């Protein structure tokens, strides 16, 4: 219902969206464009990394999980710098920067 109506943005529907990708997909189907019970890409993209930074998404020591969160929200610079710090994934982060360049 609230995937069709883009409502109840605060309720993460955790009963059915238990994975991270299920959350991203749940919200990107809820973002809106031009006051209550409404979320926009700017709020969502900022809300995610500002409040729930790397710390929240890298506790499982899985780096790509956070990268996908930033890249699939149009925050390409964040995801590039972030992934560029993983000494094992420097190569990959430089190139995804070149492509964007």
């Amino acid at each position: 219902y609230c995937i069709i109506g883009r409502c109840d943005v605060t309720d993460n529907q955790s009963e059915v969206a238990d994975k991270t990708e299920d959350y991203l997909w749940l919200k990107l189907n809820q973002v809106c464009f031009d006051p209550q019970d409404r979320l926009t890409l700017s709020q969502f993209q900022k809300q995610l990394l500002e409040d729930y930074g790397e710390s929240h998404f890298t506790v499982n020591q899985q780096p790509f999980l956070y990268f996908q969160v930033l890249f699939l929200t149009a925050q390409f610079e964040a995801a590039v710098a972030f992934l560029f710090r993983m000494e094992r994934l420097r190569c990959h982060a430089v190139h995804v920067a070149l492509v964007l360049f």
């Binding site: 994975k19 991270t20 990708e21 959350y23 499982n60 899985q62």
Partner: peptide
């Protein structure tokens, strides 16, 4: 309260 469990 988003989960941190990656789709595996």
């Amino acid at each position: 309260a988003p989960p941190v469990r990656s789709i595996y």
